[PDB]
Design a binder for this molecule. Structure first.
Ligand SMILES: CCCS(=O)(=O)Nc1cc(N)c(F)cc1F
Ligand SMILES: CCCS(=O)(=O)Nc1cc(N)c(F)cc1F
Ligand SMILES: [Mg+2]
Lengths: 150, 150
């Protein structure tokens, strides 16, 4: 269907961007809104309401640029805003070597049903936060499976 | 009116981005559609259909990124597409030392009523192409006035 074809295009764009940033160890934080509304967090960032593309996602997260610090939040198959604030988790069960990007992802996942993707600037490792847990060191296939499952 | 205020915000976003890129010698090519529709050229680029911000404009043109080569085409208060193709002018009134961004800007200005802004990556100079003419070495004040008059 058209809806299915658009979902797969968006998944492909995300995974291509994430792979590029993982290879270059570009830190990234990308939250996909689901049933719990995230308008309060969207409003803390720079409005985009942009079509998704791997190119735009990459350009957003380039280090030392206006938009790279904070979360991209996606909603209704668009990039709603960039450089958004997310609440930092206080969970004592996050790996102790991880920093604020991962704690922000876990934090939003504790109070929403969203799915957040994180790329580590230290290692290029890819992780996903959902339901208060962080799933670390994901392969490309594993991230794809999570996006399709979501 | 709201239209008038939106125009003012868009002009403020453009001038802030251009000023930042000029200071850093970040090459840029930004075409503002007016009454001649530019769909043919928009369709050659990556679709964004994004709300304008100085932050997004800057992020687009950062060197060695997916979106930085080619033109951004704006429609009113939106960035329609990035990395767009524009025709190259053969005009003999383009300074011989100038490269493809300036020739593309003059080229589109010969077949549309659009206004195109160019930042030189060699000098940081700011120029505008309109109606087949290139006006170089613009001050911040002159650029803002040209945009307001447009
Ligand atoms: C612009 C970065 C915001 S963030 O990525 O979501 N991290 C972050 C989030 C919060 N709430 C904070 F107090 C401090 C932070 F560094
Ligand atoms: C991606 C570059 C597109 S451009 O900025 O409009 N420059 C350009 C434009 C045309 N038409 C060309 F044949 C070669 C070019 F380099
Ligand atoms: Mg002069």
């Amino acid at each position: 269907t058209p809806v299915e074809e658009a979902q797969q295009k968006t998944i492909e764009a995300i995974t291509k961007a994430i792979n590029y940033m993982a290879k270059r160890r570009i830190g990234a934080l990308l939250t996909i809104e689901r049933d719990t509304g995230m308008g309060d967090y969207i409003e803390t960032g720079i409005p985009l309401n942009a079509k998704v593309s791997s190119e735009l996602l990459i350009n957003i997260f380039i280090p030392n640029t206006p938009l790279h610090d904070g979360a991209v939040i996606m909603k209704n198959n668009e990039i709603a805003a960039a450089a958004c604030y997310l609440p930092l988790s206080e969970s004592p069960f996050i790996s102790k070597e991880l920093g604020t990007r991962h704690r922000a992802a876990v934090g939003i996942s504790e109070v929403t049903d969203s799915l957040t993707i994180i790329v580590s600037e230290e290692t290029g490792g890819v992780s996903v936060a959902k339901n208060g847990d962080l799933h670390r060191e994901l392969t490309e296939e594993a991230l794809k499976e999570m996006l399709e499952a979501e």
